[PDB]
Design an enzyme around this catalytic site. Structure first.
Site, short mmCIF file in Angstrom:
data_model
loop_
_atom_site.label_atom_id
_atom_site.label_comp_id
_atom_site.label_asym_id
_atom_site.label_seq_id
_atom_site.Cartn_x
_atom_site.Cartn_y
_atom_site.Cartn_z
CD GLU A 48 42.97 39.68 33.80
OE1 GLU A 48 42.86 38.63 34.45
OE2 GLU A 48 43.89 40.41 33.87
CG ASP A 88 50.38 41.08 44.62
OD1 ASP A 88 50.13 40.40 45.60
OD2 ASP A 88 49.90 42.20 44.46
CE1 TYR A 101 50.31 38.66 30.71
CE2 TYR A 101 49.16 40.68 31.26
CZ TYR A 101 50.07 39.71 31.62
OH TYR A 101 50.70 39.82 32.89
CB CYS A 147 53.00 39.03 35.77
SG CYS A 147 53.44 40.69 36.15
CD1 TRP A 190 43.49 44.39 33.56
CD2 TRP A 190 45.56 45.19 33.25
NE1 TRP A 190 44.33 43.33 33.34
CE2 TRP A 190 45.61 43.80 33.17
CE3 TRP A 190 46.73 45.92 33.07
CZ2 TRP A 190 46.79 43.12 32.88
CZ3 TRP A 190 47.91 45.26 32.79
CH2 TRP A 190 47.94 43.88 32.66
NE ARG A 234 57.59 40.23 34.36
CZ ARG A 234 57.47 41.22 35.24
NH1 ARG A 234 58.23 41.21 36.32
NH2 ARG A 234 56.62 42.22 35.10
C1 LIG Z 1 50.89 45.07 42.62
C2 LIG Z 1 49.97 44.42 41.65
N1 LIG Z 1 49.74 44.98 40.51
C3 LIG Z 1 48.88 44.48 39.47
C4 LIG Z 1 48.75 45.14 38.26
C5 LIG Z 1 47.90 44.67 37.27
C6 LIG Z 1 47.19 43.47 37.46
C7 LIG Z 1 46.40 42.94 36.45
C8 LIG Z 1 45.68 41.80 36.63
C9 LIG Z 1 45.82 41.04 37.79
C10 LIG Z 1 45.19 39.64 37.93
N2 LIG Z 1 43.79 39.48 37.58
C11 LIG Z 1 42.62 40.16 38.04
C12 LIG Z 1 41.36 40.18 37.39
C13 LIG Z 1 40.29 40.87 37.92
C14 LIG Z 1 40.46 41.53 39.15
C15 LIG Z 1 41.70 41.51 39.81
C16 LIG Z 1 42.82 40.81 39.27
C17 LIG Z 1 41.54 42.19 41.13
N3 LIG Z 1 40.08 42.63 41.14
C18 LIG Z 1 39.81 43.24 42.45
C19 LIG Z 1 39.27 44.69 42.37
C20 LIG Z 1 40.33 45.79 42.18
C21 LIG Z 1 39.80 46.57 40.94
O1 LIG Z 1 38.75 45.85 40.36
O2 LIG Z 1 40.33 47.67 40.66
C22 LIG Z 1 39.35 42.57 43.79
O3 LIG Z 1 39.82 42.87 44.95
O4 LIG Z 1 38.26 41.66 43.59
C23 LIG Z 1 39.51 42.33 39.98
O5 LIG Z 1 38.42 42.56 39.47
C24 LIG Z 1 46.69 41.48 38.82
C25 LIG Z 1 47.37 42.72 38.67
C26 LIG Z 1 48.22 43.23 39.68
C27 LIG Z 1 48.52 42.52 41.09
O6 LIG Z 1 48.03 41.46 41.42
N4 LIG Z 1 49.32 43.16 41.93
N1 LIG Z 2 49.93 37.47 40.89
C1 LIG Z 2 49.97 38.36 39.96
N2 LIG Z 2 50.72 39.38 40.22
C2 LIG Z 2 50.70 40.32 39.24
C3 LIG Z 2 50.03 40.30 38.04
N3 LIG Z 2 50.28 41.43 37.30
C4 LIG Z 2 51.11 42.14 38.12
N4 LIG Z 2 51.42 41.54 39.31
C5 LIG Z 2 52.30 42.02 40.30
C6 LIG Z 2 53.76 41.44 40.18
C7 LIG Z 2 54.39 42.55 40.88
O1 LIG Z 2 54.05 42.64 42.27
C8 LIG Z 2 53.82 43.80 40.19
C9 LIG Z 2 54.39 43.90 38.61
O2 LIG Z 2 55.57 44.38 38.74
P1 LIG Z 2 57.04 44.20 38.22
O3 LIG Z 2 57.31 42.78 38.49
O4 LIG Z 2 58.13 45.04 38.70
O5 LIG Z 2 56.97 44.31 36.68
O6 LIG Z 2 52.48 43.39 39.94
C10 LIG Z 2 49.26 39.18 37.78
O7 LIG Z 2 48.51 38.85 36.84
N5 LIG Z 2 49.30 38.33 38.79
#
Ligand SMILES: Cc1nc2ccc3ccc(CNc4ccc5c(c4)CN([C@@H](CCC(=O)O)C(=O)O)C5=O)cc3c2c(=O)[nH]1
Ligand SMILES: Nc1nc2c(ncn2[C@H]2C[C@H](O)[C@@H](COP(=O)(O)O)O2)c(=O)[nH]1
Ligand SMILES: Cc1nc2ccc3ccc(CNc4ccc5c(c4)CN([C@@H](CCC(=O)O)C(=O)O)C5=O)cc3c2c(=O)[nH]1
Ligand SMILES: Nc1nc2c(ncn2[C@H]2C[C@H](O)[C@@H](COP(=O)(O)O)O2)c(=O)[nH]1
Lengths: 264, 264
Positions: free
Chosen positions: B58, B169, B94, B146, B80, B166
């Protein structure tokens, strides 16, 4: 105020000696956060008298979207005078960005009107942000935003605000930024029918100039007193209709003011 | 890791129940800050297993200025996917903001290269900032940033970084953002010939989704293990030149993973 004094001491105790732009040298720390419960009183420092008046004009100058120190001279706020050009212009500083951020494609976004409308229609939003950090216009600014990014949040009928401050003159400007942001929360909360929550202050390069030491020592030895209380005398029709006469401070009894040189 | 487990415990203890855009419900606090001295070890959570590979990809993606999921897909990053259009486009999230924020006058500023140039030539600068928050294009973004704004700092030959998030999760995303920014630090520090200092995380709305409570409590019953160690096996000619193979994580023995549902 307790939080303030502890940050000042913390700079003295762990601050790293840096040579800064101005070539004056600073005592600096990186990353600090403090919290102000606004329900406890107006976060106006009582260990050195501060003028709520210069605070209120600089705040109303920003909400109006003004970038000319004229309004500020006419109301005796002079801090900004050494940064303006011969016309009194600063470039697209704070006020400009809050009220008219220019899109790459000819439009302007009014971030205070957006924020107002989100507080009124979508209080849970995690995107209630105002940014003065317009990357695209930094070179036109006399000074790059110090107080650069701030976010609002409502939880149980209360409005809180967190500010991100990239660079902070602890002795001179901090007192000013805390009261100004406390004031805005107060004004945003009245326009929106919310209660005041907390003011969260987060700093980047937080410093003391090497020439504010005697004055800092002098301050660290005074007893902070009970915080004052803000009164908003009238509820204007908009966040933009406030005026100086509208605000009053009750129970403010500070220790005499402390003079110190500004670093240019 | 202790800081992360203490943040979780803090939302549980002081969080307030908030409604959210997703309709899921969160428990959230407003304003938090934690510090990780990168010299103590690489901050990859050990109380649940995280995959360093998908954190690297990423970041390599952000550093390339890419906003299409294809590269993420060829390497098994599917987080994503749901945000992406039919073409795999996320809009100017980003990476585009990082490598080419569009200015009003038809210029594009590359903030990564600017920060690198500031690190080498004026490390004492109070304005070494990368912002992903382009107010002007937020309406074009699949998701508003975020991890929105970060600032570098050098003191005693060590590079520190502070990120302002900002919306967070805590369960799902945070381990990922913590590891990602600690890797960016290691990469900037390697290019500029600095040693790693601290990573400071600051949060806005920091939350636990309603549906992560059992996973959260299970994780919290675990004892953190010693932090892994990061080894970079080469010095590329630019920050843009790292390959997934240049990094090795040593001594990572995490507890088993725990799955939780993503709120959309
Ligand atoms: C509610 C919510 N929404 C999101 C939306 C987009 C995001 C983009 C990136 C990241 C942060 N960075 C990464 C970078 C790589 C992975 C993951 C997160 C989670 N992940 C999973 C697999 C889920 C998937 O790969 O679809 C895991 O459980 O290991 C990854 O490969 C979080 C969100 C969130 C997030 O954390 N929460
Ligand atoms: N920790 C973390 N949370 C993320 C990331 N991207 C999205 N989220 C979480 C924040 C919120 O739970 C949701 C985005 O929603 P919102 O804040 O309404 O725009 O996804 C990220 O990179 N990291
Ligand atoms: C080195 C340095 N430079 C600055 C440059 C511009 C600033 C603009 C605003 C603020 C914070 N906002 C206010 C708002 C009003 C006043 C002051 C600051 C300082 N001030 C002084 C000096 C200003 C004046 O004399 O009119 C005092 O003690 O009375 C004011 O009336 C600080 C700076 C700093 C700052 O704090 N430090
Ligand atoms: N606290 C505070 N300090 C300020 C303010 N504006 C400027 N400063 C200080 C921060 C630095 O000491 C100097 C600006 O220099 P620089 O950080 O290099 O942009 O002025 C402000 O509004 N508040």
């Amino acid at each position: 105020m307790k939080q303030y004094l502890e940050l000042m001491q913390k700079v003295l105790d762990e601050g790293t000696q840096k040579n800064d732009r101005t070539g004056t040298g600073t005592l600096s720390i990186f990353g600090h956060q403090m919290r102000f419960n606004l329900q406890d009183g107006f976060p106006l420092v009582t260990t050195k008298r501060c003028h709520l008046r210069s605070i209120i004009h600089e705040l109303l100058w920003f909400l109006q979207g003004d970038t000319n120190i004229a309004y500020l001279h006419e109301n005796n706020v002079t801090i900004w005078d050494e940064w303006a050009d011969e016309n009194g212009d600063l470039g697209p500083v704070y006020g400009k960005q809050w009220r008219a951020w220019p899109t790459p494609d000819g439009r302007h976004i009014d971030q205070i009107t957006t924020v107002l409308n989100q507080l009124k229609n979508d209080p849970d939003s995690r995107r209630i942000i105002v940014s003065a950090w317009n990357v695209g216009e930094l070179d036109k600014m006399a000074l790059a935003p110090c107080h650069a990014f701030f976010q609002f949040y409502v939880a149980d009928g209360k409005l809180s605000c967190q500010l991100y401050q990239r660079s902070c003159d602890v002795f001179l400007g901090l007192p000013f930024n805390i009261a100004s942001y406390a004031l805005l929360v107060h004004m945003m909360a009245q326009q929106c029918d919310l209660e005041v929550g907390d003011f969260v202050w987060t700093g980047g390069d937080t410093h003391l100039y090497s020439n504010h030491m005697d004055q800092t020592h002098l301050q660290l030895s005074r007893e902070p007193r009970p915080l004052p209380k803000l009164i908003i005398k009238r509820k204007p029709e908009s966040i933009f209709d406030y005026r100086f006469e509208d605000f009053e401070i009750e129970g403010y009894d500070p220790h005499p003011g402390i003079k110190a040189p500004v670093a240019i």
